[PDB]
UniProtKB/Swiss-Prot annotation:
The keyword Metal-binding applies. This is Troponin C, slow skeletal and cardiac muscles. It comes from Homo sapiens. Disulfide bonds: none annotated. Keywords: Acetylation, Calcium, Cardiomyopathy, Disease variant, Metal-binding, Muscle protein, Phosphoprotein, Repeat. Ca(2+) 1 binds at residues 61, 63, 65, 67, 72. One of its GO terms (biological process) is cardiac muscle contraction. It is linked to Cardiomyopathy, dilated, 1Z: A disorder characterized by ventricular dilation and impaired systolic function, resulting in congestive heart failure and arrhythmia. Patients are at risk of premature death. Cardiac muscle Tn-C can bind 3 calcium ions per molecule. Domain I does not bind calcium. GO terms for molecular function: actin filament binding; calcium ion binding; calcium-dependent protein binding; protein homodimerization activity; troponin I binding; troponin T binding. The keyword Metal-binding applies. Residues 12-47, 48-83 form the EF-hand domain. It comes from the Eukaryota. The gene is TNNC1. Troponin is the central regulatory protein of striated muscle contraction. Tn consists of three components: Tn-I which is the inhibitor of actomyosin ATPase, Tn-T which contains the binding site for tropomyosin and Tn-C. The binding of calcium to Tn-C abolishes the inhibitory action of Tn on actin filaments.
Length: 110
C-alpha cells in the first residue's frame, strides 16, 4: 500500500533510497527500467534474458509507465516484509488491531 509505504521511518526510507540510487545512476528519467535492471543484474554476476527483464519490471510497475519509481520501489519492500508476515499470529494481529484503534481515533479527532 502507498499508505503503508508512508508508515516507514525516514531512516528506513533513506536505506531504500541509497539502494535505488545505484539502480538509477545511469537512468535519465530517474526511474528503474530494463536498461538499468539489466546492467545491475550483470554487475551482480547474473546473465538475464530480455523476457526476464520485462517480467521483473512489469510485476512491480503499478502505474504502467514501463519504469519503477521510488514510490513503486518502496511498495515492493513493503510487500516483501508483509508477505513474510505469515504464517504468524501475534505480530500481524497486534499490528492490525493497533491500526484499527488508530483509525478510530483519527475519525474522532479529524
Ligand atoms: Ca512505474
Amino acid at each position: 500500500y502507498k499508505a503503508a509505504v508512508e508508515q516507514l521511518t525516514e531512516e528506513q526510507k533513506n536505506e531504500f533510497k541509497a539502494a535505488f540510487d545505484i539502480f538509477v545512476l545511469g537512468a535519465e528519467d530517474g526511474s528503474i527500467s530494463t536498461k538499468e535492471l539489466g546492467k545491475v543484474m550483470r554487475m551482480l554476476g547474473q546473465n538475464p534474458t530480455p523476457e526476464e527483464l520485462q517480467e521483473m519490471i512489469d510485476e512491480v510497475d503499478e502505474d504502467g509507465s514501463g519504469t519503477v519509481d521510488f514510490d513503486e520501489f518502496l511498495v515492493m519492500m513493503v510487500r516483501s516484509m508483509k508477505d513474510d508476515s505469515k504464517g504468524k499470529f501475534k505480530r500481524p494481529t497486534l499490528r492490525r488491531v493497533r491500526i484499527s484503534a488508530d483509525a478510530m481515533m483519527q475519525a474522532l479527532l479529524g
